Structures are given as C-alpha cells and as structure tokens.
Amino acid sequence: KVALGGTFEPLHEGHKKLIDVAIKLGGRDITIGVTSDRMARARIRSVLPFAIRAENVKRYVMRKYGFEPEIVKITNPYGKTLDVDFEYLVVSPETYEMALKINQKREELGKRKITIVKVDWMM
Amino acid sequence: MKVALGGTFEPLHEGHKKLIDVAIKLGGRDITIGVTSDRMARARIRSVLPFAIRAENVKRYVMRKYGFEPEIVKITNPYGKTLDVDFEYLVVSPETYEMALKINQKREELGKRKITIVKVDWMMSSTRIKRGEID
Known part of the structure; x- marks a missing residue:
C-alpha cells in the first residue's frame, strides 16, 4: 500500500508524524525502508549504524502502535519504487x-x- | 477535531477523491469537510453548482465509498474554521x-x-488506490 523511507537519525517528531501518516494509510502491513550506512552518510553526518536506526524505528512503532513493522534496507535512491505499484509514497x-x-x-x-x-x- | 479538508469540489474529480481517501484514513469519522460557499467558489472558478448540490455530491460519494455521512461545513472565508478549531492534520x-x-x-x-x-x-496516470478505511 505505502512506501516510506528514511535515515531516521535521530528519530524526531517529524519522523513520528511521517510514521503516523504512513501507518494510517498503510496499516499494520507496512514495510518501512531504512537507509544503508552509505546512503545515510551521503545525506547527513550519520553516526548510528543501520541496525541501530532500524531497531529504534521498530521499537518505537511497537510502543506506539503495538506491532513490529517490517524494515528493509534501502541501498539505492529508488528502493522498491520502480517495480512495485504502491498506492502512496509518504x-x-x-x-x-x-x-x-x-x-x-x-x-x-x-x-x-x-x-x-x-x-x-x-x- | 482530527482532520481538516476543504474545497469547492466542482466537479468532484479523482484528485478530490485522493484527498478524501487520505483524510478519512487519517481521521475516520473525526474529519470535517469544508465546502466553499457560492461566493467563494465563483472567485476561483466559473462555478455552476450551488453549495447545496456540491455538499450533497461530496456526502453521497463518501457514503457510497466509506459508509458514513461526513460532517460538512460551509467555508465563508479563506481560513474556514482553521484559525479557531484545533485540528491534528490539514489535508x-x-x-x-x-x-x-x-x-x-x-x-x-x-x-x-x-x-x-x-x-x-x-x-x-496514477497507481490504483483501494478506497476505504484500512482497520
């Protein structure tokens, strides 16, 4: 249903609003993309490993929404977005x-x- | 009030339907749909549908696709109620x-x-969107 991607460092209120809108649109369904270290560092002075950022997002979603979202590593700028006919890109x-x-x-x-x-x- | 959405909705097109889908997914029944007064509609477009008809068109569409009658408020100034009411989201x-x-x-x-x-x-173009609430 919904494509959502980010670096999520730090996990701030803007990310939280993004995640809320994505979950409302996509349900307990969703997979969230989290950037690889390479992709993160191109865009920001990132100091948290992928595994740490992904787990921060996973635990946050579990605390707030009661499910563990699926996380996929984004290794290029497009992710799955050229091959999947998503309904919404959040x-x-x-x-x-x-x-x-x-x-x-x-x-x-x-x-x-x-x-x-x-x-x-x-x- | 959870979600604000506004428009003239003449005609009610696929764009409006996307807005409505997003608003309902965000807010459920806790949405307010503003529909512009005739005065206001005419400043933007050459509007040929009265407020009452535009409001009913929106109401029937939402009933048909989402199974409830939405709250409609007439917008009589550029802000509608959005300087007064606390909304979480504005779509x-x-x-x-x-x-x-x-x-x-x-x-x-x-x-x-x-x-x-x-x-x-x-x-x-656009990819298909399955209209409805997701719950």
Missing part, C-alpha cells in the same frame, strides 16, 4: 525531491506515478 | 498548500498550535 520535506525523481523515472518507464503524500514537519 | 493539494502554510502562520500569530500539513500531490 515523504517528508527532506525526502520530497527524491519522491518527485522517483515519479519522473516511473513515468519515463511507462509506469503509473504513485501519489506522493508529503508530511510537513516544521523541524 | 491539502498543491492548489491549497500555500494557503495551508498561511493558516499555520496565522495560528502562530494568534497563539494557536500549528496543524500538521499533509500535502497530497494529486496529479491533476
């Missing part, structure tokens, strides 16, 4: 431009664009 | 996003907590 101000690039690429490949849902996070 | 399209930012600017000036803006890029 993004923040920091991931919005890449969402636009994902849709531009989908359209270039004859794929339907995904509806982008940008959760503004006042950070 | 907007690219056409209404600048006004959402203005809403939060004024809320801050007035001493109200900001609302989380949820901008749906409604693309007026």
